[PDB]
Design a protein around this ligand. Structure first.
Ligand SMILES: CCCCCCCC/C=C\CCCCCCCC(=O)OC[C@H](O)CO
Ligand SMILES: CCCCCCCC/C=C\CCCCCCCC(=O)OC[C@H](O)CO
Ligand SMILES: CCCCCCCC/C=C\CCCCCCCC(=O)OC[C@H](O)CO
Ligand SMILES: *C\C=C(C)/C=C/C=C(C)/C=C/C1=C(C)CCCC1(C)C
Ligand SMILES: CCCCCCCC/C=C\CCCCCCCC(=O)O
Ligand SMILES: CCCCCCCC/C=C\CCCCCCCC(=O)O
Ligand SMILES: CCCCCCCC/C=C\CCCCCCCC(=O)O
Ligand SMILES: CCCCCCCC/C=C\CCCCCCCC(=O)O
Ligand SMILES: CCCCCCCC/C=C\CCCCCCCC(=O)O
Ligand SMILES: CCCCCCCC/C=C\CCCCCCCC(=O)O
Length: 264
């Protein structure tokens, strides 16, 4: 996997190499800082919605561990030699992020469906189609990036296939949001629409990073990709979870849960 990603193709200046290392370790801290937040405010969420804030804690730790894993893989694979960081070992690859997504994306979708107040047959039904569409998306994406060095045309046709799953997934999500937002309490029918558009923007950065190999094949493409992943991660995982949490509490208060009312 290491040799199949463009990170292995280049030497990095100390500035590039440390910028990337600082992006990843910063991502670690941010996710684990938010984890503590998500842990604390759980007591202010009615039992109905408490699972939602719990799923954020799962996403936070899942992301934080992969980012910490990549931060160390990054420093193990390169040594500063003759004024540049040069690959020493094949211990770094992006495929671990795609593992981070296989695991976190189901949690991210499920917390959305919970605050939409879906239940029973529909919740289980909608979650199954969304998770399968999502996995098809990630899986065809993982296959394609195995070729980002050797066969760009394969990266492209696997991206096209992956994008079909993405579009179908978004249509299901958007359709459920707009048909069930009338059930949301505390005015959260207005906030959930902003969440959907937040999702649309943040999730679309990943395919943009995915394509960096095809239009910026150089050490600055590598830096740019990690910068895009960092913005996307922070937006699709942290900010998203915060808003999901805010909707969970607001609906808990509107439903008579007192710890939510006092907290607000
Ligand atoms: C290839 C895309 C075809 C996949 C077609 C998936 C159809 C199933 C589906 O989308 O059901 C969602 C529904 O809105 C929830 O009840
Ligand atoms: C390369 C493979 C082909 C690529 C071609 C891409 C086509 C782009 C079309 C739509 C964007 C998909 C996002 C769907 C946005 C949400 C849809 C939605 O929510 O529908 C509203 C609902 O009908 C109200 O009740
Ligand atoms: C490095 C840190 C970055 C990681 C993020 C830092 C943690 C929280 C930041 C902003 C929260 C604002 C968004 C949350 C809005 C609703 C939360 C809420 O209602 O909290 C109830 C009250 O605070 C309980 O006492
Ligand atoms: C960390 C949370 C999320 C939701 C990550 C989301 C990732 C995607 C939406 C990835 C999408 C891709 C597409 C549409 C086609 C290129 C392959 C990717 C898997 C990067
Ligand atoms: C909760 C408060 C913040 C928790 C975060 C604590 C430390 C995160 C930093 C992880 C260190 C990764 C460095 C790995 C490396 O560069 O070799
Ligand atoms: C970088 C994060 C550092 C934050 C300060 C460290 C102190 C430990 C963190 C949180 C304290 C526990 C929060 C409990 C919430 C109050 C619940 C209540 O009012 O009953
Ligand atoms: C693949 C199978 C995917 C199916 C996942 C379905 C549900 C998982 C957990 C559901 C959480 C129940 C929340 C309780 C509530 O509605 O308040
Ligand atoms: C635990 C992860 C496995 C999940 C299985 C169920 C979801 C799979 C969804 C669609 C997978 C499409 C894969 C395309 C086949 C080509 C991959 C290959 O060449 O090995
Ligand atoms: C399962 C969902 C669709 C899989 C179809 C895409 C396979 C195209 C691969 C062609 C290739 O790169 O050799
Ligand atoms: C990620 C979304 C999918 C991107 C859509 C792109 C559709 C394919 C467009 C034209 C394919 C042309 C392939 C020729 C390039 C291969 C050889 C080369 O790059 O030098």
């Amino acid at each position: 996997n290491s040799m199949k990603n463009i990170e292995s193709l280049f030497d990095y200046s100390a500035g590039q190499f440390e910028f990337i290392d600082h992006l990843l370790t910063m991502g670690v801290g941010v996710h684990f800082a938010a984890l503590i937040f998500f842990l604390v405010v759980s007591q202010f969420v009615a039992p109905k919605y408490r699972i939602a804030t719990a799923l954020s804690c799962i996403v936070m730790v899942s992301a934080g561990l992969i980012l910490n894993s990549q931060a160390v893989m990054w420093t193990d694979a390169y040594a500063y030699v003759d004024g540049s960081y040069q690959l020493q070992d094949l211990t770094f690859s992006n495929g671990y992020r795609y593992v981070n997504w296989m695991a976190t994306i189901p949690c991210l979708l499920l917390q959305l469906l919970i605050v939409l107040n879906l239940k029973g047959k529909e919740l289980f039904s909608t979650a199954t189609w969304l998770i399968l569409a999502a996995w098809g998306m990630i899986i065809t994406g993982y296959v394609g990036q195995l070729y980002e060095v050797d066969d760009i045309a394969q990266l492209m046709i696997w991206g096209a296939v992956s994008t079909a799953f993405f579009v179908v997934m978004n249509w299901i999500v958007g359709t459920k949001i707009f048909k069930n937002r009338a059930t949301m309490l505390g005015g959260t029918d207005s906030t959930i629409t902003k969440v959907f558009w937040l999702m649309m923007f943040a999730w679309t950065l990943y395919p943009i990073a995915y394509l960096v190999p095809a239009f910026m094949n150089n050490a600055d493409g590598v830096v740019l990709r990690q910068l895009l992943f960092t913005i996307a991660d922070i937006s699709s995982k942290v900010i998203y979870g915060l808003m999901i949490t805010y909707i969970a509490i607001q609906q808990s208060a509107a439903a008579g849960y007192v710890p939510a009312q006092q907290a607000l």
